[PDB]
Design a protein around this nucleic acid. Structure first.
Ligand SMILES: [Mg+2]
Ligand SMILES: [Mg+2]
Lengths: 336, 96, 48, 134, 134, 144
DNA sequence: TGCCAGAGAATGTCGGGGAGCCGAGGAGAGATAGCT
RNA sequence: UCGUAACAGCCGAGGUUGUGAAUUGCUUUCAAAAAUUUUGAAAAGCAAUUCACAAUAAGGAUUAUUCCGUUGUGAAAACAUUCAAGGCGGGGCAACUCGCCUU
DNA sequence: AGCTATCTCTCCTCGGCTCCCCGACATTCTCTGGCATCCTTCC
């Protein structure tokens, strides 16, 4: 009973973002005066990116004066096929105004019903008689239109026209959650997307910036499947150490990260493998709430985890690592 | 616009050259006006109206090269175009 | 004592051991402490 | 309840093992996660490169490890020079020592664990110098 | 449109009185309001206190006035040690020099001016070191 | 606030903090009866210097701080001593609206002064002082 | 006592946490061509 | 009764972003004109149909008709791969590929 | 001609992806309130 209730579950982690690249390629080399083909290593520093950098779809940036642009936000565009999924709301998302006018006029001509208007037959009818809905002016036929969207997207690259293509992060690549501390005492939460992590690691720096634009000192970074400790309400502490004889309660107050989005980090108690009842949005009853995740502790106090959490590193066997009077001595002995 | 000494045959950095396009004071001009005029005359004979794209000239060259003489730059254009769309090469075990 | 229970509608595909990771450690402890006498007695190597 | 900062000699005694007892004291002090000013770090780097002749790469690795795990670096304050001028009116220390004191005080440090700084007296009624080896 | 930093030798050649032409070059460098790392400021202060034997109070007055109006000091970047380790792999400079280079680069400095480096040599395809005196 | 200035000056520091907590370098402080210059919208002034070629327009684009509250700073064209008509609550017409002074330029452009203004210091005789090569020479010629 | 500093009144913008839609792998349900 | 199932390799055709081009379009801006209204030229933003071309995970080697870049190990920012000869022979006009025998 | 087993034709809850208020917080300009009473020296 004691041993089982005094167990911390160890989770394997692989935060591979970049790595050394191995390249054995064959070429002609001169040995004892004869030139022979043999495979050689690649010389220099070659970095292999170990994560899917972005999504497949590529969008181009546009500047529409007739659309309000929120600060820190980017307006992009992408070609799409014209089909029945286009309504009066959808036509408002088309970059070209003249196409909007022609398309709306033809749609109204067919009872405002996209199903018959935007069937392939309807597209053919519009293309063969584009004069009527374009004020009698000629017009080139229409098959695809560049719909615009509003969101956070980044350029693929810098060299060439790779700066003209905008993409978005691949699903499941949000792997870092920074928690910064200011001298006042307020904790600030941030999520570092992947591309900055690749850039920083390529520079030889750390994955997460050590201070945000507030100037706040970085407390710690979080990745999926790492363990944090949530102190008691009356036990407001800074580090608390004492990580060699944690009791049943200390161990029971340990949580684990799964999902990071925006400023939100979602936690589940470390020893919870499978929920008794999967949450149902219709009945709104289950062991855990929507998304089967809680930003707050399960206990009645329901305190937010990110406010008081302290990261703890756990080795393979379940032990907790903390600095001691001897690890510093080995640190100095390594360089002497 | 192409390296030939260290990076053999590769485009020079931050250069996007078009073979049939020449830039003069930022103004882009076609390079095969004679074959273009030949295509215009041919399309006029066919009855098609006018004002066809400049870059259709590749196909007039390809048809012409079967029986007539074409310029060396036109030959380079045709070869670099053929490099694009090699085609399907069926392997063992299929009939089609 | 009050034993854990699951209602009928929620008991489809439910396991007591599957809900917590520590059941693996419990299984390891159980299998460890069983001697060779235990295994060759529960395998009926002496039944005949 | 009160912030604590350290001087370069604390790190030097932690590293160098010629006197084992002072090394143990320095290690014990470092165990409590003490704050440190960047000037102390640069002085430590200079001393290691010069006095102990360690090469650049291992010195940088040691500094990065120490800052990541052992000690908390303090951000440099913009008022270091003006305050250092102010402190010079009443106190007669070295200029580098004055800069260390000014950066420690401007970051609300209340104790400066040092040795070669005539321990005991308060500084500007905000910080006090304490010799931990006595 | 570019950012310019400087080194300790530039300030010294401005202050010294035996290289009149280099004095000039230094002074019209300063007319453009260059940037400085805190490292060169500390080294300049140490050199003044050590080489020229000019007392502490005047050192502080002069450096306060310079940082106030002549020059724009640069905030000491937090990633200085890691980046210095990264640059230390392929460039064989002094650790002080590489620290100056790293913190200069981290502050988006495009051109550094000095004499103690390889003139025109490029570091990490980000900064260009120039000898303005030649 | 005056309390912070009192404490900072007592400590020997300067009146205005060199660096706000936001992490922004201090460009300049402003006091009542200070002089600032507002550059034209088209032009970009970053290291212009050269404050001897003061023609009609450059001088006419010189404003003076009058009062301050929170993040709001109020300016008056430096040559204005008495308003032609002061503000009134009934007719609500005044030369410089309700505050008798504008946060922006008086002219038609109506550009917020604080966003582009540059501080200017002058001697008693109304002569603009800016750094020169000789001044930089002397500033540490004196310490030698 | 005129005027400075700040309260006071209209706006417009944005986090943020629930409402409501809604894309998607997957299970009844069957017409049907390969098989007998 | 286990095991085999995983790892690799030679190719294709699009799409997307962008550059240039032919032809039309929608909006905005000085009026050039008419007797407060329209005709408008020219530019800018946004496209449409078609053609040529560049890039196609950021990027780094190499001149072999070779590549590395979404796997694994773990700090050493370090790696994994290949392994001499001799004929016998099958295929292939060719490049080359595939098996057997012998240290 | 009759059986069936591999397809296809349509319903679902999950994991997302927008609305959606709703309250709080910049900007921009305008009212509003403020220590008062106190005698001699004292010419
Ligand atoms: Mg010292
Ligand atoms: Mg130097």
């Amino acid at each position: 009973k004691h041993n089982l209730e005094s167990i911390i579950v160890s989770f394997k982690q692989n935060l591979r973002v970049i790595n050394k690249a191995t390249n054995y390629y064959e070429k002609y080399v001169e040995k004892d005066g004869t030139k022979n083909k043999e495979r050689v290593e690649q010389a220099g520093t070659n970095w292999a990116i170990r994560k899917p950098m972005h999504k497949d779809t590529v969008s181009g940036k546009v500047d529409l004066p007739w659309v309000k642009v929120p600060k820190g936000k980017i307006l992009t565009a992408t070609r799409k096929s014209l089909d029945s999924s286009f309504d009066l709301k959808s036509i408002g998302s088309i970059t070209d105004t003249g196409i909007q006018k022609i398309l709306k006029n033809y749609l109204a001509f067919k009872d405002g019903n996209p199903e018959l208007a935007f069937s392939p037959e309807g597209i053919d009818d519009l293309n063969k008689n584009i004069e009527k809905y374009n004020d009698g002016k000629p017009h080139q036929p229409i098959n695809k239109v560049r719909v615009f969207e509003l969101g956070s997207k980044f350029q693929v690259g810098q060299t060439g026209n790779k700066k003209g293509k905008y993409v978005e992060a691949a699903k499941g690549t949000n792997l870092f959650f920074a928690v910064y501390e200011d001298e006042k005492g307020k904790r600030s939460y941030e999520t570092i997307p992947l591309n900055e992590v690749i850039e920083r690691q390529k520079q030889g720096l750390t994955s997460v910036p050590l201070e945000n634009e507030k100037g706040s000192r970085l407390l710690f970074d979080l990745s999926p499947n790492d363990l944090v400790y949530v102190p008691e309400i009356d036990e407001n502490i800074d580090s608390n150490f004492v990580f060699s004889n944690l009791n049943k309660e200390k161990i029971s107050r340990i949580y684990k990260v799964e999902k990071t989005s925006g400023t939100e980090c979602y936690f589940v108690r470390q020893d919870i493998a499978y929920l008794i009842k999967q949450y149902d949005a219709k009945t709104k009853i289950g062991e855990l709430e929507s998304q089967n995740k809680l930003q707050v502790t399960m206990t009645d106090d329901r305190i937010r985890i990110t406010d008081t959490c302290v990261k703890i590193n756990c080795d393979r066997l379940g032990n907790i690592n903390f600095i001691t009077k001897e690890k510093i001595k080995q640190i100095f002995n390594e360089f002497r | 616009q192409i390296d030939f000494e260290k990076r053999l045959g590769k485009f020079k950095v931050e250069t996007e050259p078009k073979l049939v396009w020449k830039n003069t004071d930022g103004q882009f001009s076609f390079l095969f006006q004679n074959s273009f005029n030949e295509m215009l005359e041919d399309f006029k004979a066919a009855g098609q109206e006018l004002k066809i794209p400049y870059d259709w000239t590749i196909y007039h060259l390809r048809k012409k090269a079967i029986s007539q003489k074409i310029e060396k730059e036109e030959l380079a254009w045709i070869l670099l175009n053929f490099n694009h769309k090699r085609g399907y090469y069926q392997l063992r075990g299929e009939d089609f | 004592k009050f034993l854990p229970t699951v209602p009928i509608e929620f008991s489809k595909g439910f396991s007591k051991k599957r809900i917590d990771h520590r059941h693996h450690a419990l299984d390891a402890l159980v299998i460890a402490c069983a001697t060779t006498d235990h295994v060759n007695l529960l395998n009926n190597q002496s039944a005949k | 309840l009160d912030k604590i900062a350290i001087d370069t000699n604390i790190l030097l005694y932690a590293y160098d093992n010629r006197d084992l007892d002072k090394q143990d004291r320095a290690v014990e002090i470092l165990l409590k996660k003490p704050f440190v000013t960047q000037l102390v770090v640069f002085e430590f780097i200079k001393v290691l490169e010069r006095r102990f002749k360690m090469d650049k790469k291992e010195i940088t690795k040691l500094t990065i490890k120490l800052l990541k795990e052992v000690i908390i670096p303090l951000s440099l304050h913009r008022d270091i020079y003006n305050y250092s001028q102010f402190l010079l009116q009443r106190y007669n220390f070295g200029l580098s020592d004055i800069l260390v004191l000014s950066d420690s005080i401007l970051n609300n440090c209340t104790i400066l664990l040092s040795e070669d700084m005539c321990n005991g007296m308060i500084v500007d009624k905000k910080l006090k110098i304490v010799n931990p080896f006595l």
